[PDB]
Symmetry: D2
Subunit: 341 residues, 4 copies
């Protein structure tokens, strides 16, 4: 008889409804349709197609789907972002990172659970672009706050794992006397950094290298930074190369630059902490973030574990801070300002 | 300042939270972890790993993620399905079809929007397995209802586009005198049909062929069916081969078998119908279904368009029915019982 | 041990969380705090208190609660509506009607279920004010559409059950030649109608009487209307007085005014229709509306039942319409344009 | 045109949909219909009406409403709880307390905001009954944990503000040597306590008085307790009588009973703590709880404020604990075990 089944089905597949919507919102941003709708205000599928080189029947399908979900409005003149659609704008970075960057990673979990199946891959270009969008809200303000508490002034900044160069673009626009150098291991991210830096008019003050963090420190680069930023880099080295390699990397920084100020941003691994995991942002962001870090060759550890690593590498903690409680009040994103002990 | 940003962020990325959960639920089913948890009641990660040949640290990560979302419970003895987790069981087919089958298709939409980029691909084995799970609730009862209104009795049943053979297994178990033949174009689905039929003990009464519908009708098969079931097949032929090809296919059926009873199940294309699109199941299922059918080489049309096609092919409508309002009350899934005019 | 209980509790009491939010949104509107925040943009609790004659500590409590839910933002200068708070503006009428008008009614259901316990009461002033706010979106445009399809032009309009007079104020502003008379049985609503009409500068063209519909038609009023609007009035008479009384009331209208055009708006009782009840607006609005009409002395019937009543009363149907599918696509709100047969 | 309005309306009035559902769930429990459906499994409206003395048409309305929301199932034999309906069972106390007890309080906020309008009233009988239901999960296990850490064993227990006597019934059943006395100021709650104690067969070991806490301590009662439980009582005295009155009350306890063990349960006022307020249970429960305590004559203060009050009253802290993180992981419900300094 299946009495009452339909009502249970609508609730039971609610995650599937939102799964498709998240992918569709990701494409709305990534394809530049969102920016086109902002610019035009109202656009017919024919006009959007001509501008972006798209096929009308596929675009009409995406537009009708988004209209049914309330992201778009449709009038005789075309489609427009609704108030709900406009409200998505600040969140672009999260969609680009988690859907663009990590959709393949989540999809690979079934096969990668098998003995010997290896680590899940990701689209590191989208991870970098997306995380840089996110960093405008959380990590860049945190880095700025810690930099203000260091002695002297920043004149030469080195950012390892720079993604598309957003930290360097923001710091260079706010602090005009700064000279900067960024290194990014992903080729696509490296190319996006060279383009963003050129678009912001900063190519004469900021240079980008296609390199990983450990290999950059071992290279014959000619730059004497007084600040080094390691934003979510150490947990990649920890997973890929091991704890002795992280300790040795940190020792090499202060051996080469004994008066340097280090700013390290890391995520505290509280995946098993019942109270922490009930916070709305812990469920929305950190629970999937922790899951991805079990399937990729990265290792998140606790605040106490990082403090032990810093001590073993011969570093002293100047101050520790978390993100503004207006943006992320979980206390899981922690920034450390360190110096040679 | 970003005043109040966090509250907006938690709401803004709610689709991303559910996107990861839908993928994780899909893997919970597809990897056979769900069936393992049902069988064991409580299983430690070590026990689940030994049984399914998995890696403990990756499995613990998936389990902790699902525990944080309330799908699993954790005690000193291990993990178990919660009441919420147990409640997901009937919906397995939807997760397998839409996530397993069509996740790649949704992910390809950005690139496939470009002029000349072609049709998005899918994992047709998972689409078939998943849709067959769904059909237990909606399409198999609808087919059974229409079959009861035809003259005479079914003795020889042909199912084109049979997926994993679920329609044939259910009809053969309910009606022991039936001899059946199924054709499935996807190799993986064909192999799953041969295995399901063997598992149900029906290999002596039901034969499966690896073939598409049009090519099967043109083959030298030796079977005289009195019923032919075309469950969501015609809209594939319509998209791939065109309307004259669908008309010619239907004419060939009644030319070869003039006394045959045809049962056709199709989805009415009401993607642009405001009232229809506000139904909870229209939003949860049909809105993504319509979107997928704009990106794949399949074409959904309206009830009136199908009736015109049937008339042009020389068929008469015996009766038309929709699914039980206990399972799907949208009126979008329509079954037609036809005969030669 | 209560393993996993908290996660189930947060979901289990979600209706309670939203119950308090709905009441708080209702007071935000009803107390004029919403209009104060629109006017001021940012207001400290001291400024809001001085303007509306409120107590600071109670207001701070309401504001902190709403801030926690994302409806308000707080800065050093005070509180303001967030984008989410601003987006609530069009829905004021629904909150005023269902919470202000009918909260007591829903709360009385337990006691009123008992044999001989009578009908639940309501705050008819808030029901009238709120329903008039709603009517701007659905019933006023429907009435306007039907009036345009009548053979005659409206010059003298009678609105029975006029609430706060919003139909008359809108029609009179749009159609300057109209003279109008409204009757409202609730004293509080009647007083709000006299005030709204005076505020809109329409007291010379619109008169309001404190009276129920049946008693108004039996009174010595001196007005010769060519249009009468009965917007959700007949189902009140049907419940309170019975079907013969509704038939007699309609017969009396066309006996007194044989050339009159009648516009009747009613809600189709589809409470037991599985497909209709899965529409998002059916669940949000019509399911509680049907419930309240089982506990108050009002009786909702079906479209066909109304058409039969009209035939018995000697009325002919000119045309029937439902609301615009941009505002309400359920087809449950129906308007009938009638004349004497 | 109101383009796209309906989609915004369905979301905008979601709090109203859940507001009516919460009230309907409250009555389902409070009227004993929930227990009737558990006992019968399937019940026709006629059978439920005969058993509880209800009117069939009003009951059918409530049942149809709940069926539409998925709480009930309907078959030819009658109505039954669905799996979703069954899952509500543990949450009865929250509905009884917040809806039964405090619905009137929330509804009174608009009028009580006015200068000199006084404190909002509540249904203290339902607050007591509901809070006692909740206490089975959080406060009773917390009290039991603290009692076990005292140097003495409990033989004579006094519970001030006992509600319906649930703490005493649970402790007395688990610990057969205990003699107990409870005081409850609300007459309805007092009568429910006398009945619960009689139903559990404990009238020979537990006596209940109709009295407030301060007046009980000033009375001529003849009982020498070695443990006193003050579960959410002190914040009532603090609001109603002031901080000197709370200090004097605590001093009087240890003057009359110098060897007594005191167990105090209080809610930490973190209403203004951004991170704490993003916890799912903080939003669902504590945010409305804080709001109600701004409109009633009760005053919630912080953990540190309570510890300072205890020091002033001449009490020493033996140990402090919060609730089990399986039931409430906010850390806002705190229990203190105290002795005379
Ligand atoms: Mg990482
Ligand atoms: Mg298809
Ligand atoms: Mg009514
Ligand atoms: Mg009634
Ligand atoms: Mg209290
Ligand atoms: Mg108070
Ligand atoms: Na890893
Ligand atoms: Na297609």
């Amino acid at each position: 008889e299946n009495t009452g089944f339909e009502t249970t089905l609508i609730k039971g597949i609610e995650p599937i409804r939102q799964f498709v919507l998240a992918i569709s919102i990701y494409h709305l941003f990534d394809t530049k349709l969102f920016s086109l709708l902002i610019k035009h205000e109202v656009a017919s599928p024919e006009v959007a197609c001509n501008e972006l080189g798209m096929e009308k029947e596929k675009l009409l399908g995406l537009f009708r789907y988004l209209k049914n979900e309330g992201i778009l409005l449709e009038t005789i003149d075309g489609f427009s972002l609704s108030k709900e659609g406009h409200a998505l704008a600040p969140f672009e970075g999260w969609y680009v990172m988690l859907v663009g960057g990590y959709a393949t990673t989540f999809l690979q979990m079934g096969e990668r659970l098998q003995e010997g199946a290896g680590w899940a891959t990701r689209d590191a270009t989208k991870v970098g672009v997306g995380s840089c969008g996110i960093s405008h809200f959380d990590a860049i303000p945190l880095t700025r706050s810690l930099m203000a508490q260091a002695p002297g002034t920043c004149t030469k900044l080195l950012d390892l794992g720079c993604g598309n160069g957003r930290y360097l673009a923001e710091f260079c626009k706010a602090l005009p006397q700064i000279q900067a150098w960024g290194a990014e291991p992903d080729r696509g991210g490296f190319e996006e950094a060279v383009d963003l830096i050129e678009k912001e008019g900063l190519s004469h003050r900021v240079h980008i290298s296609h390199s990983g963090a450990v290999e950059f420190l071992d290279s014959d680069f000619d730059f004497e930074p007084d600040f080094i930023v390691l934003g979510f880099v150490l947990h990649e080295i920890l997973g890929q190369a091991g704890r002795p390699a992280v300790v040795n990397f940190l020792k090499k920084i202060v051996h080469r630059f004994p008066a340097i100020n280090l700013i390290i941003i890391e995520v505290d691994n509280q995946f098993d902490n019942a109270g922490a995991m009930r916070h709305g942002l812990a469920l929305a962001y950190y629970n999937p973030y922790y899951l991805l870090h079990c399937f990729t060759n990265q290792l998140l550890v606790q605040d106490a574990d990082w403090l032990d690593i810093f001590a073993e590498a011969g570093l002293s903690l100047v101050t520790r801070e978390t993100t503004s409680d207006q943006v992320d009040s979980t206390g899981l994103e922690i920034g450390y300002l360190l110096r040679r002990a």
